[PDB]
Amino acid sequence: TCPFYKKIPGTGFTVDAFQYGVVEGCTAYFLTHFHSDHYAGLSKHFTFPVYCSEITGNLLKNKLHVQEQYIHPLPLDTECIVNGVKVVLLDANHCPGAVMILFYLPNGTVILHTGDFRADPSMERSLLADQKVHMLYLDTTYCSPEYTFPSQQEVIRFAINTAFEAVTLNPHALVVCGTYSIGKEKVFLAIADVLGSKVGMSQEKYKTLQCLNIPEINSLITTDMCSSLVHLLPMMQINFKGLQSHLKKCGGKYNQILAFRPTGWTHSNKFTRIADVIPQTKGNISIYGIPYSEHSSYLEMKRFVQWLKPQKIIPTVNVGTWKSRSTMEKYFREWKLEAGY
Ligand code: NI
């Protein structure tokens, strides 16, 4: 049955709640982004109204075959009326098409649901600046002070410099990047741009990327693997066995692989700077784990919440254990006492 933290009080609405069958009293299902833990349950047989971004709606129609008549895409940064309630979609700084949702309830309560997000000071100047928020449904994925990670810009600088150096030393090296969902496209696109190559990939992955409104995409991606020296593979194939096998398939065009796994956080973060990251190597294969996150660090999350000053916080992640819940509630209280709200 649907958990309370997916239900918006005072409305007929749910958020990211497609795996529970017909939710009692739900008149409109919102979807914040196209990640499987959130869309799980949608298909061509879904016949209730789904409200989402334009990019999310392209993915629903083309990948899951949801019928057009039930997809209701909304423009960002625009006040819209849904079943008599004003809503606004805001950029979540997560993956392409990902949104946060502002609900303006009929009684005067204002609720922000962040979906999945990577908090940024740029958010302090959207439509959030303009009114008070009473309740915050918060992405608490990395809600503990051990979770530090560098900026996305520092991580992409490291990746570009590492790839450009390796291929300039050896023009017969192949670069491989792992993927299993949308998100993190900058990693493989930035590396292909520095190398003067397109990114090669499966037809299924090319189809997914063509749903994303990324400018000049026909210019950066391809299904012709033979013409590309940057290849995208499933994340599960980014290991020495999977990569050895891939290199066999390239028919002696290449004699070395440099591969990237963009993880979120890993405990090499608590000790090591980005500058200092080293690969795992076996023979002619090297694998870099790079801390490219599309979720808030602890300090980013803290700053956003101390800026917004909500009256009540409802965590949406890590809610399944009493130790996690108690930990998070203790940090929320600290933040409120330190800031004075
Ligand atoms: Ni997500």
From Swiss-Prot:
Binds constitutively to TP53BP1. Binds CDC27, which is itself a component of the anaphase promoting complex (APC). Binds PIAS1. This is DNA cross-link repair 1A protein. Expressed in brain, heart, kidney, liver, pancreas, placenta and skeletal muscle. It comes from the Eukaryota. Belongs to the DNA repair metallo-beta-lactamase (DRMBL) family. Changing D139N: Impaired nuclear focus formation, reduced interaction with PIAS and increased sensitivity to cisplatin. It comes from Homo sapiens. Induction: During mitosis. The mRNA encoding this protein contains an internal ribosome entry site (IRES) in its 5'-UTR. This 5'-UTR generally suppresses translation while specifically promoting expression during mitosis, when cap-dependent translation may be impaired. The chain holds residues 700 to 1040 of 1040 of the full protein.
